[PDB]
Design a binder for this molecule. Structure first.
Ligand code: IPD
Ligand code: IPD
Ligand code: CA
Ligand code: CA
Ligand code: CA
Ligand code: CA
Lengths: 252, 252
C-alpha cells in the first residue's frame, strides 16, 4: 500500500499502546541506553518495536533513534522517531508526536508527523503540497509586529536582542512538531543553533515544511542538507520567510 | 451543589461549545473590548456567558477577565478566566485552561483549573490538599542539576545567567495552567516579573499550588498577597523550593 497508509497505520497503533503511559512516571522506567549515550525508557522501546513489527516486513532501510541504522540495500529508507519529545510525554506536557519520513534514494518522497493528543496528521508527498487532516497548510505571511517563535540557543546568542526583535515566545520541547507549527502558520520560525537535533527528529517534518513554503536552512543561510543516520546533530533554521531568516541569521 | 461541582459543571459545558473553535481562527470575530482594552473574541464571550449563567443565581461576587467585577455584596467571591491561553487556543496550540477559584471572606477556599485537551481536573479545597483527577499531587523535589522552568522575564534579567543555572526550558503562554505544572511536579517553577498576570490568571491555581506545597512570592521574595480585582497586574514567583526561589531572586 501507499506510505501515508503505512505511517498512519503504525501511528494509530503506537497511539493505543502508549497513551496510558502519558504523564505516568509512576509506571515508566529506564530500560536501556541508546547508542547516542542516551536513556531509553520503557515507553520508547514499546513504541519503537511496534513500528519495527511493521517496517521490517517491507525490506527497506529503517532509521531510528534507539537503534541506529539498519541497512537492507533498498532504495527506500524510513526515518522514524516513534515519540518526539518524550520528556514532555512522560511528564504530562501535551506536546509530542510520531515522526515517519520516507526517502527514495535519499530524496524526500513522503513525510508524516502525527500529534497524538490533538489527533492531527501533518503530511506531504514530495511535490504534492502540505496537508493537515486533509487540508492544505501554508507558512504564514511575515508581520514583524507579530513575530512568534521558538528557539534553542547557544551561548553565542544575544537573547535580549532576540526577545527585543520578536513579539511572542513559545518553547515546547519537541522539535519535529514545532517544525510542523511553522508549517501550519502558527509559528514564524523555530531553530536550534545549540546543536542537539538530528535527522530522526527533522526528516518527516522536513518534507512537510518544504511543501508548506518553509525556508529550511543551516547556521549560515544556505539550504540545509543532511545525512540519514541516528548519529550527527545539526544546526537548523525553519523560518517562514527570507526576512524572518534574516533577523535570526542576524543574531548568530 | 458543591463548589467543586459547580466548577466542574461549568467546565464541561464551556468545553462543548468552544472546542469547535480550537485552532479555527477562520471561525471567530472580535465582539469588543474587555474593559481593559484587548480583543474580546467571540469564543471569549460565549465561554464567559456560560459561566455567569450558573453563577448569577448564586449571588456571590464575580471577578471575570472580560467583565471585571460584579459586586453583589456576598462573602463569597468567584474569580474566573473562562479561557487562559486565548492565543494558543485559536492558533491551535494545545495549551489553554479554564480557571475557577472560590474565596470566602476574601480567603482561599477552592480552586479548579481545567486542562481541556488532557481532560485533567486540577483542584484543591483550601486546607485539604491538591488533586489532579483524584490523585493527590505535590511539587517536585528540588535538584540543582535538573532545573526545569518556565518564565516571562522583564527587560532586566540575565537570561544568560538564567539559562546557565537551569537544565530545561519550556514557555507555554498560559500562566494559569503553567502554575499547576509546578503544582503537579513537572516544572521546578514558573514566574512573571514582566508585570502582566492579573488576579483572574492565578486565583484558582494559587490555591491548588499552595496545597501542593509551593512557595508563592513577589519580586522581593516576600509572600504574595494579591487583591481580587480584574485590574492591575502583578509580579509572581511560584516555586517548588526555597533554593529554586533564591536562584530566581539572584538574577532578579
Ligand atoms: O529525545 P526525544 O524526546 O525523543 O526528542 C527531543 C526533541 O526533538 C527536542 O526538540 C530536542 O531538542 C531533543 O534533543 C530531542 O531528544
Ligand atoms: O489573555 P488570556 O490568554 O486569557 O490570558 C493570558 C495568560 O494568563 C498569559 O500567561 C499572560 O502572559 C497574558 O498576559 C494573559 O493575558
Ligand atoms: Ca524519541
Ligand atoms: Ca527525538
Ligand atoms: Ca481569557
Ligand atoms: Ca488569562
Amino acid at each position: 500500500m501507499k506510505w501515508d497508509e503505512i505511517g498512519k497505520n503504525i501511528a494509530k497503533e503506537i497511539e493505543k499502546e502508549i497513551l496510558p503511559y502519558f504523564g505516568r512516571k509512576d509506571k515508566s522506567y529506564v530500560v536501556g541506553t541508546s547508542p547516542s549515550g542516551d536513556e531509553t525508557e520503557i515507553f520508547d522501546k514499546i513504541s519503537e518495536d511496534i513500528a519495527l513489527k511493521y517496517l521490517k516486513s517491507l525490506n527497506v532501510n529503517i532509521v531510528s533513534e534507539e537503534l541506529g541504522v539498519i541497512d537492507n540495500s533498498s532504495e527506500w529508507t524510513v526515518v522514524i522517531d516513534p515519540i518526539d519529545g518524550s520528556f514532555n510525554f512522560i511528564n504530562g506536557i501535551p506536546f509530542f508526536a510520531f515522526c515517519f519520513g520516507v526517502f527514495k534514494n535519499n530524496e524526500p518522497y513522503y513525510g508524516l508527523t502525527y500529534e497524538f493528543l490533538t489527533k492531527s496528521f501533518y503530511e506531504a508527498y514530495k511535490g504534492k503540497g502540505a496537508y493537515l487532516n486533509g487540508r492544505k497548510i501554508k507558512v504564514k505571511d511575515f508581520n514583524p509586529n507579530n513575530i512568534v517563535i521558538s528557539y534553542y540557543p547557544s551561548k553565542k546568542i544575544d537573547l535580549e536582542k532576540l526577545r527585543n526583535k520578536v513579539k511572542r515566545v513559545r518553547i515546547f520541547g519537541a522539535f519535529g512538531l514545532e517544525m510542523c507549527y511553522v508549517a501550519k502558520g502558527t509559528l514564524d520560525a523555530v531553530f536550534d543553533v545549540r546543536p542537539k537535533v538530528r535527522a530522526v527528529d527533522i526528516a518527516s517534518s522536513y518534507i512537510i515544511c518544504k511543501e508548506a513554503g518553509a525556508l529550511i536552512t543551516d547556521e549560515n543561510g544556505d539550504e540545509l542538507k543532511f545525512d540519514l543516520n541516528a548519529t550527527d546533530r545539526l544546526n537548523i533554521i525553519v523560518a517562514n520567510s527570507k526576512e524572518m531568516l534574516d533577523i535570526i541569521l542576524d543574531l548568530l
